[PDB]
Amino acid sequence: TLGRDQYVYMAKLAEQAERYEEMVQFMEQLVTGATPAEELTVEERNLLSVAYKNVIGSLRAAWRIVSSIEQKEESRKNDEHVSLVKDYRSKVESELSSVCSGILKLLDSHLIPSAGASESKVFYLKMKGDYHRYMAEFKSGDERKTAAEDTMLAYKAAQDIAAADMAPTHPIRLGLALNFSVFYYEILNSSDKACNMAKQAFEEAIAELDTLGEESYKDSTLIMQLLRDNLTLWTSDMQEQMISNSAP
Amino acid sequence: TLGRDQYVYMAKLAEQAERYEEMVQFMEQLVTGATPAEELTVEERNLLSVAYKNVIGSLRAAWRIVSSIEQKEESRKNDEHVSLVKDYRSKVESELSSVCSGILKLLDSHLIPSAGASESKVFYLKMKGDYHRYMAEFKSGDERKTAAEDTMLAYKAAQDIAAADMAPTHPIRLGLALNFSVFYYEILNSSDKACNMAKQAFEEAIAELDTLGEESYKDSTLIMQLLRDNLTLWTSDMQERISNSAP
């Protein structure tokens, strides 16, 4: 076993080598060894989030490609290749599930219990909704509806806490509104609800934009632009009743 | 167990998804089931080469980064951080060793025996030397010399066959001379021999490049352009980067 400061060094070392599967292991060991008794630092909090974002991001990108090839093979009526491709996609899906379960388990057992402030709660609850949403991207029915309900619970909990204590210009609250609006748009097909949410968070940040500090102005404004980009792509598109840019 | 044609489809599928560790496995099983009784098709032979190239390239890239991190830490005399980085580098080295052994074992047990033509023999022998050279990159001391010796034998064997049966404009023979010259410059620090070897291959090829058509002109000239890129880098290096190996 290494020290807390040493796992941060090993996580960064793995980050430089783009060996993210091991960056996750180094941060998990840091988490399980310092929480829930104590709270993660902003640095450790972001290193963990970055580690899982890259690991799952790589599998999400692969799943898109495989799923796309499957549709291309089913349009050819190539029954042979369709059988092989679906075997492969399920292998990627089991790995997507493995990673989401890892962080979701760490969120319930360690991270959320460790949050002793609204900022940390909203961060981990948002994160909890994020990886439930990733589960909902490849699940079919029932499993997807369950994945969607778990997403709704985690996000709406983070939204309640954030709106009451977080500032509308805080990147975490902004990122929450972004990913939450992506949830309505891409998981629930509610363009109207998703646009109304993104716009509200955007305008709320504009009103208090003067009181935005050096530390988080780029993080905030970046999310603000992603909200505006999505809102343009969504309003440019046209739904009927009821990829998008998620947070950094 | 799947069929030969299907392993090709799965290897191609893994390549599209950029899941190269699996692309290797699909081809490994294709090889162990089809050879040495028969020989790999050019397609299969290339799918195998690409799969291992990406896997070992990814680790070689990480090893350069980690190895670079270690040096800086030592320059500051952190001591603690230094011991941590080496333990991490040694983990990447064990993986590099695992990959190379995988293809090297596949070469000596299945692929080289299957080669019933000089072109294939030189392709598989040139590959054997490539992955012994990758061992020599991170090995040190006693283990390094053994790796450098194994590289010399694979390349020299491929060169003997190539110079006798392959044309000096053939991309495989040009790539061999390219990687074989990089071996002398990077591993053995023989700046002169690496240059003499590169120039010879580039001279022997241009002397026959006129009679070469536009079908493989891009193939030959591309490796030729790499032979001179290294040869320009090396000359400037003697005016006191990583050499361009073959595609």
Author numbering:
A (entry chain A): 4 to 245, 1170 to 1175
B (entry chain B): 4 to 243, 1169 to 1175
Provide text from the study.
Brassinosteroids (BRs) are vital plant steroid hormones sensed at the cell surface by a membrane signaling complex comprising the receptor kinase BRI1 and a SERK family co-receptor kinase. Many phosphoproteins of the BR signaling pathway, including BRI1, SERKs, BKI1 and BZR1/BES1 can associate with 14-3-3 proteins. In this study, we use quantitative ligand binding assays to define the minimal 14-3-3 binding sites in the N-terminal lobe of the BRI1 kinase domain, in BKI1, and in BZR1 from Arabidopsis thaliana. 14-3-3λ and 14-3-3 ω isoform complex crystal structures reveal that BKI1 and BZR1 bind as canonical type II 14-3-3 linear motifs.
We found the C-terminal 20 amino-acids in 14-3-3 ω to be disordered and thus crystallized a truncated 14-3-3 ω1−237 in complex with pBKI1265−272 and pBZR1169−175, yielding better crystals diffracting to 2.35 and 1.90 Å resolution, respectively. Dimers within the same asymmetric unit are highly similar, but the ω isoform dimer adopts a more closed conformation when compared to 14-3-3λ, even when bound to the same peptide ligand. Asn233 forms hydrogen bonds with the backbone of both peptides. Mutation of Asn233 to Ala in 14-3-3λ had little effect on pBKI1267−272 binding in ITC assays, but reduced pBZR1169−175 and pBRI1869−874 interaction by ∼5-fold and ∼2-fold, respectively (compare Figs. 1, 2). The mutant protein had no tendency to aggregate and behaved as a stable homodimer in solution, suggesting that the mutations do not interfere with protein folding or homodimer formation. Together, our mutational analysis of 14-3-3λ highlights specific binding of the pBRI1869−874, pBKI1267−272 and pBZR1169−175 linear motifs to 14-3-3s from Arabidopsis and validates our pBKI1 and pBZR1 crystal complex structures.
